[PDB]
DNA sequence: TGAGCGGCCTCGGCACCATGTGACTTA
DNA sequence: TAAGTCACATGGTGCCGAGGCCGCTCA
């Protein structure tokens, strides 16, 4: 379940998206010193698994609130349809007083 | 679904000359048949002086449909008082050509047909009567559905009909004996006896014969093509002065 | 003022101003229900005299006429 | 709402083609229709915004209806009441 | 509960808009301008058909359905563990006792309903037990005193009729 | 559409706990009738009954039901009790 | 409703003489459009046998006029 | 939280509440706007007695149905009516306009297979009705008593879900099902319906009623007939039904009266005028006839279709018009079952047969039971000379 | 003179039996 | 090749809700 939000996160990271070459590539433009382009690409897989890993304990923490809430609910409907044992004897002392 | 409207003729006008007149006129010609029918063939429907005359006029141009096949019936018996009746299927509009050169070529009074109660009744027994090849007459049995419209003060029983299966009309036959004219001796009696209701008195718009015809009171419509010898005979007892 | 029934099993009526609505069987009462709620009036004496109500009619009338007084 | 046409629109627009050429519609065709008329319109307005003489018979030569002048005013002669087809071969 | 709209705003909201923003942000103080504005542009340029709201929703469907598969288990597990006596087991009138009265107290129907009552921590089992008991004492000695009181008043009956 | 979906699954097991219920009834029914009263311990002046109740389905109940309306008759009605609790005397005495 | 009637709906849409005349050719090119349609819908249910027309049918004929146009 | 309260508006159109509106009669308009404004208020601004006073100007005004319809579709609830209003109008209708309803009875058997005779407590069945049918769909019902019937009238409105349509937020309504309750008859009326909603409605009026033993509704007729006062007198619990026709004589009593009476009255005494029935076969052989004689045999007419001499009260109208029944005769000639199928149509059945039975065409000696109205609005076969009904 | 209810009635959608013909088999 | 069984596709009778105009109709 939680492998389809991983899948989600991980396909749209810039270093996953974009190789190091293609970084590279792209960036002849400015700079052509690959010392530079290779602390830039240090500091880029830095920030994004850094935020990789702030997302999975943001989307663990909506799972496990959602997860606990609708269980709630579920746990409230099924106490809902049955029958707890003490209001059943203390309806039976009601009736045992109305039969003396 | 063939419905035959039926005139009368005032008199016995002999068609196997003449009929050149009506090719010129329509620019076609016509496949006029003569045959000499004998209907009362049993004994008790009468021995002498059952012999008719059928013509059977055909505007035959092609066969697909009434369209084109707009036919012509005619019976003839000269020892009556009224001698000829027609009867014409299809929807063509030459067929009132027909009758228009009818009547100026040969001075004939002709009136539409309405049948009564009885006519119906006698009309639903011919039409089951079927002449074999072999010249013996087999009765046929149709599930029949006697259909009444009656008029009634506000309305209050606009129609009523009275369905009667195949197997319980000859039933009823064979209950009464062997006879000839099914729906006239055992049908109509065993209603009469049993819900009180004489068919013949109350008012009948039709009768239904499942899959062969259903006759009204003033038109037959029929899904065989033709009509038999036993149906055109009442109808040539009916208009009788 | 009361309400019949076709076949008078299914009443309601009025005492002083409490609506006692009954269920009665063949000649005997299987059923009673006091409904008006007065704030001098409780529940639990409604329930006594619901069950004490129960009965025959002859029996009904005689304990009825007994508690208005 | 507004922009839409009824149903009964397309009855009394289309019924007597349906009945001289024998044309069966039901409910649900008739819905289709009447949201397919949107489209059409959509479609005309697209290819033909505004009016003016030589594109409009271009574009009908275009559309694969017509060939000529001759087809647009016997077309015309088809679709219109006497008076607004003498109107149309004055205007063409 | 609506659990698809809290799934799917918390999608649009956290995943997509925070994703955005904090990649601009962080592309743009990474140093510097036109790097962050290429790098941006190629990373739009490869994302294509998958940032897309149909994307969204086709996920936000399927975890539904991960979730929906998950709540038929849970709620097998949770319908076939019954913990006390349910309900459409006992009479209308012990049902009708339970979540308040609708006033009528009728006496032959508690008689028939309890005389149907199911038998079964211990010391609440052993005490419903023999409540239980005790209630099918009360009805034998009411049907008992039923029939009794019926005998002497045909008896008083006759004494008075003799007395009278 | 969650909430029918419950609907429909609590209505289909209530629907095969009670085609289960009515069918093993139907076999217990079966099997008290082969093994517990048609055997050698039957009392003799039971044999009558069994025999227009399942040898050969009018004397039986007909003729009861017809003569408590003719003589407008009781019986002695049994104590109603269950899961075989028999009446105690004592206790019913001393209530 | 005459072809006027449509002519009035176009101007209606889109808000002398002789753009009336214009309308007048469009509400007859939208007529034409139609009964093209139409018997194309009629060639298509002939073809699979059908008396009377479909919605997909007459979706499959206008997408062919459509991919034509 | 999906059962409808008596505060909720629904999206309904205001020509087709302004038409209905229409046929009520002024002074059920005037009672319905004030218990409207003494329940929920409306927009209008002004005390009870105040409007009270206002409706009052109106009424010695003289003013048409017309101008307070505008009134209080315009200004009193402009927005829109709630639900209960939308129900109590055609309640309403109903009552003014009973022959425009078609009703359906279902014998309401239980068990073992002996009619349950069904007892309602109303607001409790109102209110558990309304919590079951609130499990599946948007359920609203209303329930009211007859003025003239001993019935009980119940009304529920079923609510579904909902190029660019652009917003409404609406709860459209489908139409109402009605379902009859009389006090004490096994018998249900409801409305001509059936779509799966009917069957929800009626499930669910089944689940609700019975609270002790499952109940089944087994329809009785599948041929609805018109005026709910007919079929009370038809399937209700009343003396007519199962005496009908030529016994309706029965049922009205008017021919014994009680054994503490004049025996200088009675039957036996003073007499009764008849005339010798011809039991041979003269009625196909057959003017003028003698006033005295025909007048007999015009009551004879009128005491086999009606039950009485004088007739339960043109005169050919009987105590209840049928549409459409069908028998279905069946007899023995001879070991062949011979079946004979009479289906009938009409606004009056028995009637019409009487007028046709005045003109001799049919034989009134010979006219059977079951033609003649007896076990009415039934159509069933005739095996054996016994009427048993279908199904 | 003007609004107005009620029988009429036809549209047409649905429901069901009825029906004629080609395809296929039997003799 | 005459006759039979078959599903199939169209014909058709009956039914009914919607709605419209009519038909007086009465103030």
Redesign the interface.
């Known amino acids: 379940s939680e492998q389809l939000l991983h899948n989600y996160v991980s396909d749209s990271l810039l270093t996953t998206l974009i190789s190091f070459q293609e970084f590279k590539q792209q960036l002849q433009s400015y700079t052509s010193d690959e010392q530079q382009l290779q602390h830039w690409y240090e500091l880029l897989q830095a920030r994004d698994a850094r935020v990789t890993s702030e997302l999975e304990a943001r989307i663990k923490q909506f799972f496990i609130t959602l997860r606990s809430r609708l269980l709630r609910f579920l746990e409230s409907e099924q106490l809902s349809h049955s029958l707890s044992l003490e209001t059943l004897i203390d309806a039976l002392y009601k009736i045992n007083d109305l039969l003396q | 679904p063939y419905t035959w409207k039926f005139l009368g003729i005032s008199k016995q006008l002999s068609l196997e000359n003449g009929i050149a007149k009506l090719n010129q006129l329509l620019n076609l010609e016509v496949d006029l048949d003569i045959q000499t029918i004998r209907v009362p063939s049993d004994p008790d429907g009468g021995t002498a002086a059952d012999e008719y005359i059928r013509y059977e006029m055909r505007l035959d141009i092609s066969n697909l449909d009434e369209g084109t096949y707009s036919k012509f019936i005619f019976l003839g018996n000269s020892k009556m008082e009224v001698p000829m009746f027609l009867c014409y299927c299809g929807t063509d509009n030459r067929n009132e050509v027909v009758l228009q050169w009818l009547k100026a070529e040969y001075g004939v009074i002709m009136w539409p047909i309405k049948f009564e109660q009885k006519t119906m009744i006698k009309l639903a027994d011919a039409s089951i009567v079927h002449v074999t090849k072999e010249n013996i007459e087999q009765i046929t049995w149709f599930s029949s559905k006697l259909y009444f419209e009656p008029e009634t003060q506000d309305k209050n029983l606009r129609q009523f009909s009275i369905e009667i299966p195949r197997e319980s009309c000859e039933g009823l036959a064979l209950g009464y004996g062997n006879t000839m004219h099914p729906y006239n001796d055992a049908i109509v009696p065993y209603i009469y006896n049993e819900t009180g209701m004489a068919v013949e008195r109350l008012p009948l718009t039709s009768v239904i014969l499942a899959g062969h015809t259903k006759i009204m009171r003033e038109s037959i419509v029929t899904s065989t093509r033709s009509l038999r010898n036993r149906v055109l005979a009442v109808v040539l007892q009916s208009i009788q002065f | 003022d009361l309400d019949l029934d076709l076949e008078s099993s299914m009443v309601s009526f009025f005492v002083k101003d409490i609506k006692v609505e009954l269920f009665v069987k063949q000649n005997e009462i299987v059923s009673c229900s006091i409904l008006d709620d007065i704030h001098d009036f409780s529940q639990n004496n409604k329930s006594k005299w619901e069950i004490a109500l129960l009965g025959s009619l002859d029996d009904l009338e005689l304990k009825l006429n007994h508690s208005f007084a | 709402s507004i922009k839409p046409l009824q149903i009964m629109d397309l009855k009394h627009l289309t019924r007597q083609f349906l009945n001289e050429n024998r044309i069966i519609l039901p409910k649900q065709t008739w819905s289709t229709i009447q949201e397919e008329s949107l489209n059409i319109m959509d479609f005309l307005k697209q290819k033909i915004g505004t009016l003016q003489k030589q594109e409009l018979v271009d574009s009908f030569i275009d559309m694969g209806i017509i060939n000529n002048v001759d087809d647009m005013f016997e077309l015309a002669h088809e679709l219109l009441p006497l008076e607004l087809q003498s109107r149309i071969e004055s205007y063409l | 509960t609506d659990t698809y709209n809290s799934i799917s705003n918390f999608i649009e909201n956290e995943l997509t808009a925070l994703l955005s923003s904090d990649d601009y942000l962080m592309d743009d103080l990474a140093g510097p301008n036109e790097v962050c504005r290429l790098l941006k542009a190629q990373v739009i340029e490869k994302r294509k058909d998958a940032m897309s709201r149909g994307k969204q929703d086709l996920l936000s469907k399927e975890i539904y359905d991960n979730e929906s598969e998950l709540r038929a288990s849970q709620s097998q597990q949770i319908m076939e563990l019954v913990g006390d006596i349910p309900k459409y087991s006992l009479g209308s009138e012990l049902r009708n006792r339970v979540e308040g009265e609708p006033q009528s107290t009728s006496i032959e129907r508690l008689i028939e309903d309890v005389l149907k009552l199911p038998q079964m921590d211990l010391k609440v089992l052993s005490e419903y037990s023999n409540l239980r008991k005790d209630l099918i004492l009360k009805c034998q000695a009411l049907q008992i005193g039923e029939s009794k009181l019926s005998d002497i008043l045909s008896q008083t009956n006759s004494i008075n009729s003799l007395t009278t | 559409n969650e909430r029918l979906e419950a609907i429909l699954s609590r209505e289909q097991n209530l629907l095969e706990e009670t085609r289960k219920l009515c069918m093993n009834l139907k076999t217990n029914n079966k099997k008290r009738l082969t093994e517990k009263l048609i055997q050698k311990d039957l009392h003799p002046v039971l044999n009558k009954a069994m025999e227009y109740t399942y040898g050969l389905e009018p004397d039986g109940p007909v003729t009861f039901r017809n003569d408590s309306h003719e003589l407008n008759l009781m019986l002695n009605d049994p104590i109603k009790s269950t899961a075989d609790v028999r009446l105690d005397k004592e206790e019913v005495l001393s209530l | 409703?005459?072809?006027?009637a449509?002519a009035n709906?176009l101007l209606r849409?889109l808000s002398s003489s002789?753009?009336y005349?214009?309308?007048?050719?469009?509400?007859?090119?939208?007529?034409?459009?139609?009964?093209?349609?139409?018997?194309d819908?009629?060639t298509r249910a002939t073809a699979e046998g059908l008396?009377?027309?479909?919605?997909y049918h007459?979706?499959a004929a206008?997408q062919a006029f459509?991919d034509?146009? | 939280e999906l059962r409808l309260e008596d505060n909720y508006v629904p999206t309904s159109d205001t020509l087709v509440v302004f038409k209905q509106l229409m046929k009520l009669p002024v002074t059920v308009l005037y009672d319905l706007t004030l218990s409207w404004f003494a329940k929920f208020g409306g927009s209008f601004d002004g005390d009870i007695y105040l409007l009270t006073e206002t409706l009052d100007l109106l009424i010695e005004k003289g003013v048409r149905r017309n101008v307070i319809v505008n009134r209080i579709l315009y200004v009193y609830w402009p927005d829109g009516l709630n639900v209960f209003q939308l129900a109590e109008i055609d309640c309403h209708l109903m009552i003014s306009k009973p022959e425009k309803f078609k009703w359906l009875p279902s014998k309401a058997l239980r068990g073992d297979g002996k009619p349950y005779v069904v007892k309602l407590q109303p607001a409790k069945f109102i209110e558990n009705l309304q919590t079951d049918l609130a499990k599946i769909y948007h359920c609203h019902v209303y329930m009211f008593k007859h003025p003239s019937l001993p019935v009980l009238i119940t009304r529920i409105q079923l609510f579904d879900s909902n190029l660019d349509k652009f917003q409404g937020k609406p709860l459209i309504s489908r139409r109402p099902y009605y379902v009859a309750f009389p006090l004490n008859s096994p018998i249900i009326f409801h409305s001509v319906d059936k779509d799966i909603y009917a069957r929800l409605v009626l499930q669910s009026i089944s689940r609700t009623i019975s609270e002790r033993e499952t109940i089944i509704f087994k329809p009785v007729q599948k041929i609805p007939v018109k005026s709910i006062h007919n079929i009370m007198t038809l399937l209700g619990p009343s003396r007519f039904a199962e005496s009908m026709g030529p016994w309706e004589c029965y049922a009205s009593a008017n021919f014994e009266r009680s054994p503490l009476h004049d025996y200088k009255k009675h039957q036996g005494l003073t007499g009764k005028k008849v005339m010798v029935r011809e039991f041979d076969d003269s009625f196909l052989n057959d003017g003028k006839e003698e006033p005295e004689i025909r007048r007999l045999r015009l009551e004879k007419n009128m005491i086999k279709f009606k039950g009485s001499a004088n007739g339960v009260m043109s005169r050919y109208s009987s105590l209840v018009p049928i549409e459409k029944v069908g028998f279905t005769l069946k007899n023995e000639i001879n070991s062949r079952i011979i079946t004979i199928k009479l289906k009938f149509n009409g606004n009056d059945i028995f009637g019409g047969l009487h007028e046709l039975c005045d003109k001799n065409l049919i034989n009134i000696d010979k006219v059977p039971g079951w033609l003649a109205g007896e076990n009415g609005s039934f159509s069933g076969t005739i095996m054996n000379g016994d009427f048993q009904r279908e199904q």
């Open positions: 409703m005459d072809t006027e449509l709906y849409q002789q753009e005349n214009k309308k007048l050719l469009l509400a007859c090119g939208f007529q034409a459009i139609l009964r093209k349609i139409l018997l819908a009629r008396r009377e027309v479909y919605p007459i979706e206008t459509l034509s146009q």
